[PDB]
């Protein structure tokens, strides 16, 4: 039950008690993912229009 690093100031204080000792994707890659998903959306809508054109 040891108290360490006790710091005190006008607005409060802090300390530490020890009870026992122990024992990314680049900007380019993100643009590709976004454009790839936008390309799959375009393809699906084109097939729908192709279907409605038939």
């Amino acid at each position: 039950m040891e108290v360490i690093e006790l710091n005190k100031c006008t607005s409060g204080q802090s300390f530490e008690v020890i009870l026992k000792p122990p024992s990314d994707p680049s900007l380019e890659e993100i643009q590709k993912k976004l454009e790839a998903a936008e390309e799959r959306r375009k393809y699906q809508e084109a097939e729908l229009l192709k279907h409605l054109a038939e």
Partner: protein
Amino acid sequence: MRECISIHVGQAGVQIGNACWELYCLEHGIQPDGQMPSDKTIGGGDDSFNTFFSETGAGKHVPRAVFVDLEPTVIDEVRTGTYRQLFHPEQLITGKEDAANNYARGHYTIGKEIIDLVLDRIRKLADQCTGLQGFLVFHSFGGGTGSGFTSLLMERLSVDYGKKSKLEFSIYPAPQVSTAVVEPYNSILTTHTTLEHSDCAFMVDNEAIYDICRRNLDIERPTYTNLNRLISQIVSSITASLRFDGALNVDLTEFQTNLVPYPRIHFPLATYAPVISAEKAYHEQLSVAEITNACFEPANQMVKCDPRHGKYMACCLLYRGDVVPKDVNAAIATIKTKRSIQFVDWCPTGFKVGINYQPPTVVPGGDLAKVQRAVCMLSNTTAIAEAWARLDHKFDLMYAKRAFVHWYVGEGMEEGEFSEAREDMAALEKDYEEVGVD
């Protein structure tokens, strides 16, 4: 002094952010017009509260915050509400149609066309920072914007601010106030892509806030305003160290150092006490031991789970009010001899304690009563993995039939991203088990 930029994404993020900045102002004595009579340095200064508020020559204290929603109705409340004068129009960003509770819609379809505008507004605030620490991101799991756009933003922030910390305040979905059936999908999709970009995330289960409002505040049917005002007290307790003079958790880096020794396991459990109804005749003020002991009761945890059956990796006690170290240690000692507190063998069995003498501020007319002392315990427990288990189960039930999947594929997302996100969660659950069980 080093600045902190807050980002609020989606309805949950925005409305919670609105409640926090209301509280921040009342705590720092800032008025709705941005004026702060106590600030004697007019138009500048590197005080602790300046980490969240900038200053103009006219003495206005402006939050370092950006609000983003793909639909305008929620953010329109901020533009015409009590604190409309705190923010300038650049800080409030709104689209025309939302993500329809569809992660893929907020991340890909709509996110792609507004992400650069949001980064531009954030860059402006960053330009006002002489030593930016990082970001605090508020959002929900279940919304299409809160889930889908947040993960896109977090990815870009890691790119544009590589050495900056990012903390989360995430709303875990609860059917009692749930809006969409697919929220388990969105929650798991956003956890998968955000996991490597978030240094520390505080999850709030709506179910937990909902039951605290009914049990402790005798609110029969809580509203979002009831939930958000309670959530902002806990959020305020967590950020107080960044806004006030102190020596514990003085910068965003210290949250990770003190609460997260393992990167993927970065979801500390929050526990708050006391929550007393304002309509009560007059409560018997609780002591340091009683409020501390209450930090080990499931009924006041932000996520209902049983910490007796997990292991601790860290524990912070954040007190506000009439508290001296002597009474804190006396309470901890008595709780060690009555409670089940097991730490992992590769971590010290200890508690970092912070005391701020100013008791919690209560919103005039709010639901919470004034208390002489309060505490918020942040503990990194493997028990919080119960929430991942619950969520992953619901995901498995629907995805086994591919129910609702066509809505996501229809926005350009590949079906494989579902299983990729799910496998990552299964690995997350396994990590918790390797650390907590024998």
